[PDB]
């Protein structure tokens, strides 16, 4: 539903969402006979939703003591910094229902 | 049963190179083979808002506010030195012959007739309508396109290439000549009977076209410009730059190329607007409307396969179009 | 009994190299060792609606608007400078030989039945007339793809390479002998047994070659071109790259070999259209149709398997076109 529907117009809006960093956790292999709820799609098939840190993934560097990096100060460059600019520029108006919700939402990001 | 391709396409003839530009003194025009080039300079520059401003929002608060908010352009400038009055532009111009043979194709019994088409045109008649047509605007200097206007003495030198040396020079005067007529002379109409040999393969021909435009003191020209981008990047970039060669301002192939080809006065509006660059679909991009409409049978892709496939010929007043922009060339079929 | 390789390729023969651009004077050509190269530039261009459209929203009161917001492209265009008329391209040919031994083989009997089929064509008939074929198509300058049309006077020039200091050399006419006439010389001859004792074994050869077309002044160049995938997307702007080397615009090792292998003559459609290239399905992409369709016994796959497995020899004329296609070298069997 959301591939189909998010690819091209195949939505109702309803329930879709995607689940990322997930890891397989098993309780006896190719040899299962541990707990129950075992056969052989579910030979110990549990997996395992995730809980990563802050800085779970690498960042590349966009400052070094270059020029491209340094010497033209004047960018403050940054991925994260793009996502947040992308973030607000995603509500850059301020409607006339959400004030409630866009009262402490804009400054403090 | 016989229908076009599906893959269809026509190398250009009348290839241009670009036009280096330089200046020096009126009178030095004998001895111009050592003209110092117009350089590409920066300046800085601001303006107030002369925009348009819509006015759903048109205060005079906001305009009096956006008064000192400046405007932060570099932008780039291209002047004569100040101790010469004159601008040359020099380009080498060839032509190829065999105007009817593509480049490629799908139907190879399809260019079996259409070559012969060609072959019926070129054998009815030369290119010589087409030729002086060139053979004009080459002789004036339509490929100076704003330093032509408001200039005093403008001038064309077109030599000609077959070995190392000039086997005849051809000089001209390019106000005299105006943009109206097309008018054969007993020198002009000797250049224009080498074009429409060269296009029929009877010898290679190799244009040198050097323009002289009498423009004043230390005044400024004008090349054609690329195309720079204010992305949002950094230090603020400019918001015109214009093309350049080896430290030297220049034109576009593209463009000079396109003065050339301005030829058709068989439009269906009128006859005193001028002539139009030759194109399917048959437009000027600064005048904004298109010529040669659909709804009108007198297309480009309507004219050639109704000439080919339906053999419903067109009058001889108009072939001289089809032929043109098959010497101009482009990528055909769907 | 004795079946084809289900898995069979050869290698390459007649093995080019990239051909590297620059531009001069004509008559300077001789101590042209130094000349600079015609380098890939950018030029902005902004064009119109040249294009066929069909009418399902192409109303005639619809293109008015189309003529002021046009598609700005930017391409990469490589020009010569304007002090310099001529353009010296320069390459490197060797020829390895042992036509008929594959590289990768299923049989054992197959491959030693084909040796020997190939063994006594080369005792019998040997590789000379290919060999003057390519001579012929080194001889002019139609590795001088567009370079060569609308040109003015080319002449190639071509070296035996074989120490630091060359063996004997070619001057030519790209012009006086043509694209039509495969019909030889007084020194062709030589240049024919040299890439015949090449593509024998009895001798290695290495040809450097260079060819000055006289393009003319400040003319368009047109070295060969790579392709635009996610950056026309990207960024939109460019939509036309060039191939490239340090500091020089390059011509394609691959359609430098497809200009050496211009051969046959013996397509069954027609004689006088012109030469192609020898490939199964002896095709062009320029002209949209394929020669050697295996709707006729005349194709190559069919050729070659009645020559070995069926045990038919096929006429004098066209076992020539079946070793052009071994020199060349692919991918055959079950792919």
Not at chain 1, 77 to 101: D, I, Y
Not at chain 2, 177 to 187: C, M, Q, T
Request: hydrophobic fraction near 40%.
């Amino acid at each position: 539903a959301a591939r189909e529907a998010r690819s091209r117009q195949e939505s109702w809006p309803h329930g879709f969402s995607e689940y990322p960093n997930l890891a397989i956790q098993k309780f006896g292999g190719t040899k299962p006979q541990n707990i129950s709820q075992l056969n052989n799609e579910r030979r110990g098939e549990n997996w395992l939703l995730p809980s990563l840190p802050p800085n779970w993934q690498r960042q590349n560097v966009n400052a070094p003591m270059r020029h491209s990096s340094v010497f033209e100060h004047d960018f403050g460059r940054t991925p994260e910094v793009s996502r947040l600019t992308r973030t607000l520029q995603r509500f850059l108006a301020k409607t006339v229902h959400n004030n409630l919700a866009i009262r402490q939402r804009r400054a403090q990001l | 049963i016989l229908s076009t391709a599906s893959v269809l396409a026509f190398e250009r003839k009348l290839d241009p190179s670009d036009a280096l530009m330089s200046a020096g003194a009126w009178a030095q025009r004998d001895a111009s083979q050592e003209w110092p080039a117009v350089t590409v300079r920066e300046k800085s520059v601001r303006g107030t808002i002369s925009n348009r401003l819509k006015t759903k929002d048109r205060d005079p608060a906001k305009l009096d506010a956006s008064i000192q908010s400046p405007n932060l352009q570099t932008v780039d400038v291209a002047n004569l030195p100040s101790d010469a009055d004159t601008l040359k532009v020099r380009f080498t111009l060839r032509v190829l012959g065999g105007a009817g043979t593509p480049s490629a194709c799908n139907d190879a019994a399809y260019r079996d007739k259409l070559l012969q088409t060609v072959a019926t045109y070129v054998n009815d008649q030369g290119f010589a309508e087409l030729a002086r047509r060139y053979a004009h605007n080459l002789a004036n200097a339509r490929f100076l396109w704003r330093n032509r206007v408001g200039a005093e003495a403008v001038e064309v030198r077109i030599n000609h290439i077959r070995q190392g040396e000039v086997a005849r020079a051809w000089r001209f005067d390019a106000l005299a000549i105006g943009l109206r007529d097309f008018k054969a002379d007993a020198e002009l109409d000797a250049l224009a009977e080498l074009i429409a040999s060269g296009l029929s393969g009877s010898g290679h021909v190799l244009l040198e076209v050097v323009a002289f435009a009498r423009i004043g003191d230390g005044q400024e020209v004008f090349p054609s410009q690329e195309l720079i981008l204010d992305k949002g990047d950094k230090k603020g970039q400019k918001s015109k730059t214009l093309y350049s060669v080896r430290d030297a301002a220049a034109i576009h192939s593209q463009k000079i190329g396109n003065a050339l080809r301005t030829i058709d006065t068989w439009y269906p509006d009128e006859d005193g607007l001028g002539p139009i660059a030759v194109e399917p679909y048959g437009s000027v991009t600064s005048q904004g409307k298109a010529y040669r409409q659909p709804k009108q049978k007198l297309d480009f892709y309507t004219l050639l396969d109704n000439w080919v496939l339906r053999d419903e010929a067109p009058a001889v007043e108009q072939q001289h179009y089809v032929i043109a922009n098959l010497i101009r060339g482009g990528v055909f079929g769907e």
